[PDB]
Amino acid sequence: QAFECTLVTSIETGAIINQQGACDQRVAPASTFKVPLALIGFDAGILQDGKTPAWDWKPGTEARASDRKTVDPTIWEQDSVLWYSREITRRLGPEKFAAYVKRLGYGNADVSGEPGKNNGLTHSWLGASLTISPVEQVGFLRRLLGGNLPFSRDAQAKTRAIMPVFDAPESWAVHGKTGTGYMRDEKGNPDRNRPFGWFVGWAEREGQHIVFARLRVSDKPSNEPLGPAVRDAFLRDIPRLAV
Amino acid sequence: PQAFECTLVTSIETGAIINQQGACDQRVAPASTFKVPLALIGFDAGILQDGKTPAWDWKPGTEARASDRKTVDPTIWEQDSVLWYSREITRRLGPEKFAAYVKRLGYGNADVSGEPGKNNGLTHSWLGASLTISPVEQVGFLRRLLGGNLPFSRDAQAKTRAIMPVFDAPESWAVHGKTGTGYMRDEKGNPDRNRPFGWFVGWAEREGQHIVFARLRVSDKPSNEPLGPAVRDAFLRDIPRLAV
Amino acid sequence: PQAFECTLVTSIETGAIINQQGACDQRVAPASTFKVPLALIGFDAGILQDGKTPAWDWKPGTEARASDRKTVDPTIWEQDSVLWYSREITRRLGPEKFAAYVKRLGYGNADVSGEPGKNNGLTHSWLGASLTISPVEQVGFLRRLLGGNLPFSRDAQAKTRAIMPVFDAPESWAVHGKTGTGYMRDEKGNPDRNRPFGWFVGWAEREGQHIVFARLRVSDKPSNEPLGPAVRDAFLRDIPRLAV
Amino acid sequence: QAFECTLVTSIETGAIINQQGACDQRVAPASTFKVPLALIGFDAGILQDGKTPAWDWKPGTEARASDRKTVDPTIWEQDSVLWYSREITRRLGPEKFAAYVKRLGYGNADVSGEPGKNNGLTHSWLGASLTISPVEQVGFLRRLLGGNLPFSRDAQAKTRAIMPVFDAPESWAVHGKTGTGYMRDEKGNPDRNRPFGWFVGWAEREGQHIVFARLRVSDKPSNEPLGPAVRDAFLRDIPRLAV
């Protein structure tokens, strides 16, 4: 159980450009969920623009030691700061959060979490219940770029605006979000020996517009976060993959 | 008690024990976890300046591993083995300074005189010749190092922490740890390749949460793999659950 | 301002200007510094393969100086004059491929339609018939070429860089540059042999240090020698000073 | 302002075999200074043998783009790698460097650099203060080959052992070091239009040992480094000159 899936699709044509692997295995989105959660936050009025609201880290909430303590939506997409996402879902509540996710048609749309643990608002996108496949990531991103999601066009445009931007060889302008996670073991604990990494988003060059998702599931531990390593490998591969 | 494993995890913010398996008071040679206090001694004594200085070169007379015959700075010294770099620090210190520094630290039994009749205190004391330390004493030393509370300059303590190898772990943890490997001494001061042991000691941090740990595994069967790396990989896998 | 000189030098590692003399936005014909983008277009279109392929022969019906009536490959083509080799590349492209390639490059004004009524877009556009570019636009194009950041395959960009002429300079610099020579157009689109101009554009590299440059001299007196080689030799002499 | 000097001397006699020009004009040794600096490095313990120490190029230091990034004393004499020589002098410090050169009696023995620039440890042998004539180069090399220099014979033997080796016509075995530099203009900047090239060393064949130095100072720019061209010309000339 260790693989890598890559799906590259033309937005204009809709046709497959490049597909490696079956691309239908569902795993937790990890922090690629910051893209649909940003859309939900902007639509609900919790998030306002790229700089509003700026929240301060509170003791007792989870964040990396390298994370910045004052976070706005733009920095939220760059750092880990799991508490920022958890504050958004807390302000939504269980019922608004579940209905929002069902309106998105995002993966299995299961944010109830683990049964008997009441962790749907804090862990569902980390491995507690919510899963999504590379083909469904692409399906969601295509709908986001076409303005077709049942969310306000203002919230959709702001979601695209805080997406991290990267430069790829051969003049490809890439907008993408990384995600790092770990498969659960028997007891339901994160397994450091089974990391997985996402890189999803879209890219443009001249007239061409593409949308992609790369997923790599490993069965050996990684010293670095796997998400950034998957992204770097994909940024190097994207000029060859898009021809 | 021929074969055992001990784990001690302590919270910096509260001072309380988070998790303890075993008695954790069995004293054993530090065996290259000693690079943590030796780095502190080096920075304080002026022998070391920063993570890139001094960069010493291996010389043909000095015995070393094949991969250790190169230029080495304090950062590389902590990442790889490079035993000769450690021995160059103690050679510059001398026996009197080295004994006074370790005694001032209260590090284990603070005995770096080596084996009597062999004059190997500067070269083998932390490898099994005299110096021993327990997991609870290692956590005690690490706890004061993190707070800048050892009787040394805060600058030297900060530089020691900065060259510690870093590892990523689930649930936003970042682990700064040093491994160690060796063999238990026999009935009369000699290695016993049937009783290997492994260390992994250090600290781990999230935002507003710091913990200090020491893991010691002593076996009664030989092992192909060095025990240090195996102990580290298992602790990094366990630390998300041992921390809550 | 009929006569002037402009020099722009930019750092790749930082993206910042190192040295600028003059405004550097005056557009003139590239005049065989266009061999750099035309080589890129040639490699990308499959017309050119590598530094030695294809080797085309001059044929008796073709305009050329005495020294250019021989076998020519891309390496020789960038080293020597050989205007007919450039004309053979654009003939194989055709007007619509040539115009789209230059527009895809964003090279200067991207106008290769030539002088209206003369149908010389494929033969004279980069020699003063339509296509113009400024020193800042030369540096911008060369900066992207050096990083493989033009909208072409990294292979074609690498082969374009490999056939650039190389010159050595003091302080361990190696300069990869292309010269250019021509005359300014007059009031009604005709050569003004009293206003010669010279280019020297390219990049220079030391270990871990890359810079991109363009120097353009426009005169108002007829020159003894072609101006390209004179601008080059002066720039090669100046580059150690301008780079620090 | 432009000339070429060549001095060829016998070891068995000390007598001149061939001399073209006056051979007393002093110019900067450039990287023929790598021969005396190698002797200083082995004697001071900074250098150990042909393969130790191996240093790595660090960003911000000067080297040709074609130079290898990992250098030992053998490769040091073959590539340019100005940073390798500069690291050697930095470990000596200003006083040990000047005292070593003074004990060597090398040219004008002036490594203080230009006044006000404090570049004695970085530019003195490139044109900032240190100069040497062809006859002084032969004088130094003759004392190196005889073991006469006031340095350990271990250091002397290792300096000779890393000297580049070339094959010359008519069975001449040549040990030579190349050097390339540029005369300074008014403000002390290197003048590309006034390059100069060294080739110095010794050569052996049957029962004949010769020492030589060739210097060409030009007043027109050189297409390639002058040093290698001077060496190639001298290797062609050496069977006729030693006759």
Residue C47 contacts residue C156 (beta carbons within 8 Å)? no
HEC profile for C219-244?
CCCCCCCCHHHHHHHHHHHHHHHHHC
Instruction: Read off the amino acid at residue C204.
Output: A
CB-nearest partner of C154 from A167, A170, A206:
A170
B226 φ, ψ to 5°?
Answer: -60, 140
**What is the rounded distance in angstroms from the CA atom of residue D195 to the CA atom of residue D183?**
6
Residue B169, chain A, CB below 8 Å: the answer is: yes
Resolution (A): 2.3
Three-point CA angle B9, B15, B18, nearest 5°: 30
Interface touch D52/B71, C-beta < 8 Å = no
**What is the rounded distance in angstroms from the CA atom of residue A184 to the CA atom of residue A129?**
11
**Cβ-proximal residues to A14 (8 Å cutoff; 6+ apart), any chain:** A142
**Cβ-proximal residues to A51 (8 Å cutoff; 6+ apart), any chain:** A72, A73, A74
Residue C34 contacts residue C131 (beta carbons within 8 Å)? yes
**What's the residue count for chain D?**
243
Contacts of C207 in chain D (CB under 8 A): 57, 61-65, 67, 69
Residue A115, chain C, CB below 8 Å: the answer is: no
CB-nearest partner of C148 from A169, A205, A243:
A169
Residue D74 contacts residue D177 (beta carbons within 8 Å)? no
Residue D203 contacts residue D175 (beta carbons within 8 Å)? yes
For residue B58, give the DSSP letter: P
Contacts of C206 in chain D (CB under 8 A): 62-65
- Check which CATH number belongs to the domain holding D27 and give it: 3.40.710.10
Q: How was this structure determined?
A: X-ray
User: Cα distance from C168 to chain D (closest Cα, Å)?
Assistant: 6
Interface touch B58/D53, C-beta < 8 Å = yes
Q: Active-site positions of A?
A: 31
User: Cα distance from B99 to chain A (closest Cα, Å)?
Assistant: 36
Q: Diameter of chain D by CA atoms? A: 52
User: Cα distance from D203 to chain B (closest Cα, Å)?
Assistant: 31
User: Cα distance from B60 to chain D (closest Cα, Å)?
Assistant: 7
Residue of A nearest to B169 (CA): A192
Contacts of B69 in chain D (CB under 8 A): 52
**What is the rounded distance in angstroms from the CA atom of residue A242 to the CA atom of residue C150?**
15
Are 3 or more Cβ–Cβ pairs between B and D shorter than 8 Å?
Answer: yes
B174 φ, ψ to 5°?
Answer: -125, 120
Tally of structural domains, chain B: 1
**What is the rounded distance in angstroms from the CA atom of residue A96 to the CA atom of residue A89?**
9
Contacts of A167 in chain C (CB under 8 A): 149
In which element (H, E) is residue A49 found?
none
Closest C-alpha among D142, D135, D108 to residue D35: D142
Residue of B nearest to A126 (CA): B171
Catalytic residue list contains B32: yes
Give the rounded distance of the alpha carbon of B62 from its chain centre. 23
Helix, coil or strand: residue A116: coil
Strand ranges across the sheet with B191-206: B17-21, B4-11, B209-218, B191-206, B173-185, B166-169
Closest C-alpha among C39, C28, C11 to residue C105: C39
Interface of A with C in 85-104 (CB under 8 A): none
Range(s) of the domain holding residue B226:
1-244
Interface touch B236/A192, C-beta < 8 Å = yes
User: Cα distance from A9 to chain C (closest Cα, Å)?
Assistant: 19
CB-nearest partner of A62 from B167, B169, B172:
B172
Burial of A93 (0-12, 13-18, 19+ CB in 10 A): exposed
Say whether the peptide bond before residue C37 is cis (omega within 30 degrees of 0). Answer: no
CB-nearest partner of C169 from D59, D63, D192:
D192
